[PDB]
Structure 1
Amino acid sequence: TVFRQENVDDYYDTGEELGSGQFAVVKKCREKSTGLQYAAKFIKKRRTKSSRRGVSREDIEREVSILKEIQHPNVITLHEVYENKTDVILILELVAGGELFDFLAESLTEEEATEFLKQILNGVYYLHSLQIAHFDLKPENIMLLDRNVPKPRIKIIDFGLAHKIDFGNEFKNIFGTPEFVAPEIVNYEPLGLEADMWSIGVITYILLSGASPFLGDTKQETLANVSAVNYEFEDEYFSNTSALAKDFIRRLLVKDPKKRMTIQDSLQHPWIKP
């Protein structure tokens, strides 16, 4: 699939840089024709077939195809796609409250955690209902619309690892951030929606405690801990946390994906269900 090949600068003015990663940079922009503001994600294309720098066309097209399908209050909205020889440029909904990661750097109550978590679950429920696994859920990929309100609204971003799961599982060596990946990712096993539910359990543990359940001193230790389900609720962090909150996490941090809570289970779990 080919994208708009007019110069993006003919239609948008960029401003503040919002973030950057290994193959991408995100810049605030303003559409000239409407004055409406967006985030422009410039994704570096692979320059040769056998190269390791940049993102392969197949991966870019998969991300774009997924983004075009989704319209939900808790998932980012793709506005337009441009491309040139060097980049594909996603024009994306502007979310100005920063990463949930950075907000957390500023521990939550269970109410504040569940207010965030319920929106994450609603967004993931939407994705999983479309058989979309995100595969990269973590606080860095949860953006807040406005971080200066009591109950910030959030949107899931960064679908660069997301896959349609139309056969129940994908076997592709998808692999995200060690602290958040499920054991099946660590072990290079077939992957499905269940891996997102593990990541939600990790997120929930962090939200409630400010601590990462599997984090080791090195990436290999983290991955080894994940595969061994080597975590515990440290009393120093969880002494005032309800047993039901711990129960929620414990039913997500389950090695066997078939025994892990699904997104529907998580919404019916007594800690979440009204």
Structure 2
Amino acid sequence: TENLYFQSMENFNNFYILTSKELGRGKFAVVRQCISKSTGQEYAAKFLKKRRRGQDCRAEILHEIAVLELAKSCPRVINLHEVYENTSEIILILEYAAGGEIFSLCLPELAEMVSENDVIRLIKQILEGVYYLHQNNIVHLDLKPQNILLSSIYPLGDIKIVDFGMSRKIGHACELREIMGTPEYLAPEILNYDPITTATDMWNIGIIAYMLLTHTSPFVGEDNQETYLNISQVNVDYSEETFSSVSQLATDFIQSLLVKNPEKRPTAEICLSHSWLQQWDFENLFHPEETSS
């Protein structure tokens, strides 16, 4: 008996054609590439079921749209173009991140195609987006590498943060939704049920840097029990073998974030001034402290 709020499914099919590129699939969401019939511009269409696990989720979807809308001025966060609705689904028409997941750069296979320069620029862009979110009292709470996309891979483009499905305000309760992330990506405070902090996102940025640089998962074990022990003890491989091609400054950056006590983690703003991320574009003329006069 529910009335629909967003633009009709008839309008969706009038304005867009879905392509044979299925981009993603979870239990209650599907992402498909679509094309504007008028312009030829590619978009991502995310189909969110309004009913999940026997719960009505339209209010939660509205909240997630409210968060995307707030980030429209931030180019590090995926842009929302339009919204449609049918009996079962709310459909987000998103900016299409043609490079796909940054997770692809963390596989041993693409190690060779990704530079130190590249990792520094991608971490800096992720920090710019997370800074913007934290200044607006938004904690993402699902910053796995599968939720950071790229505008292109050949050549390497710009990052786009996606999937605000878990996002909250600072100090909201850590309940079931929280503690059902992918186990190897959960912060220690989530395992202890502590109130939400911006510091949880900073833990996840540490994991992203670790995976981009080592091509290995810092916390995953043979089973969930082992994963949860690795997180809760912060048992991370910093061996000479794993880090032989990783700079000390990158190690320092990671080791500052992967710490048990969230209050000891640096903020996004402090991370943006980290010595690792300070780099001069060699094609620019540097103006040194000793002036010609």
> How does the TM-score come out when normalised to structure 1?
0.91
**Residue among 63, 79, 82 paired with 2:81:** 79
Assess if the C-alpha contact under 8 Å between 1:103 and 1:147 holds in 2. Answer: no
Structure 2 unaligned runs (5+)? 280-293
The aligned amino acid for 1:96 is A
How far 1:261 sits from its partner (Å)?
1.1
Superposed CA deviations along residues 52-102 of structure 1, whole A, max 9, x for unmatched, are: 167722321221110111122211001111111111101100111111112
Aligned counterpart in structure 2 of residue 118 of structure 1, from 124, 133, 136: 124
SS in 2 for 1:251: helix
Quote the Cα distance in structure 1 between the aligned partners of 2:50 and 2:95: 22
Are residues 1:3 and 2:6 paired? Answer: yes
Aligned counterparts, 1:171-190, within 5 A = 171-173=173-175, 174-175=178-179, 176-190=181-195
Q: Please report how far the alpha carbon of residue 6 of structure 1 lies from its aligned counterpart in structure 2 after TM superposition.
A: 4.0
Distance in 2, Cα, partners of 1:23 & 1:222: 26
C-alpha deviation, 1:36, in angstroms: 2.5
TM-score by length of 2: 0.85
RMSD: 1.8
Count of residue pairs the alignment pairs up: 266
Is 1:138 aligned to 2:141, yes or no? no
Query: 1:201-225 deviations in whole A, cap 9, x for unaligned?
Result: 0111111101111111122321221
Aligned counterparts of 2:14 and 2:191: Cα–Cα separation in 1: 44
Q: Is the 8 A contact 2:184 2:228 kept in 1?
A: yes
What is aligned with 2:282? none
Distance in structure 2 (CA, Å) of the matches to 1:103 and 1:207: 6
CA contact (8 A) 2:48 2:90 kept: yes
- Distance of 2:71 and 2:24 partners within structure 1: 23
**C-alpha separation between the residues in 1 aligned to 2:31 and 2:55?**
15
Question: CA 1:203 to 1:137, structure 2 compared with 1: closer, same or farther past 3 Å?
Answer: same
> Match of 1:161, SS?
coil
Structure 1 residues 147 and 55: CA distance shift in structure 2, 3 A: farther
- CA distance in 1: counterparts of 2:218 and 2:92, whole angstroms: 33
Query: Partners in 1 of 2:16 and 2:55 — Cα distance?
Result: 23
Q: How does 1:30-49 map to 2 (within 5 A)?
A: 30-46=35-51
3-state SS of 2:91 partner: strand
| Contact 1:45–1:55 (Cα < 8 Å) also in 2 | yes
Identity %: 47
Question: Which residue identity does 1:9 align to in structure 2?
Answer: N
Whether contact under 8 Å (1:194, 1:257) holds in the other structure is yes
Give unpaired runs (5+ residues) of structure 1.
none
Tell me the secondary structure at the aligned position of residue 191 of structure 1: coil
For the pair 1:206 / 2:211, whether they are aligned, the reply is yes
Does the 8 A contact of 2:82 with 2:93 survive in 1?
Answer: yes
CA distance in 2, matches of 1:246, 1:126: 25
Measured against aligned partners, the alpha-carbon deviations of 1:218-254 in whole angstroms (never above 9, x if no partner) come to 2232122112211131221202322221111111011
Task: Check conservation: 2:106, 2:213, Cα contact below 8 A.
Answer: no
With 103-112 and 232-241 compared, the bigger mean Cα shift is at: 103-112
- Structure 1 residue 190, shift from structure 2 partner: 0.6
Q: For 2:38 and 2:115, locate their aligned partners in 1 and report how far apart those are by CA, in whole Å.
A: 44
Query: Which residue matches 2:233?
Result: 228
Q: Secondary structure at the match of 1:236?
A: coil
1 CA distance for matches of 2:55 and 2:214?
Answer: 36
- How far apart in 2 are the matches of 1:99 and 1:211? 16
What corresponds to 1:68 in structure 2? 69
1:14-61 CA-partner distances (Å, limit 9, x unpaired): 112111122111111122344322110001121xxxx61677223212
Matches within 5 A, 1:85-96: 85-96=87-98
Q: Which residue of the partner structure matches residue 290 of structure 2?
A: none
Q: Identify if the C-alpha distance between structure 1 residues 148 and 6 changes in structure 2 by more than 3 Å, giving closer, same or farther.
A: same
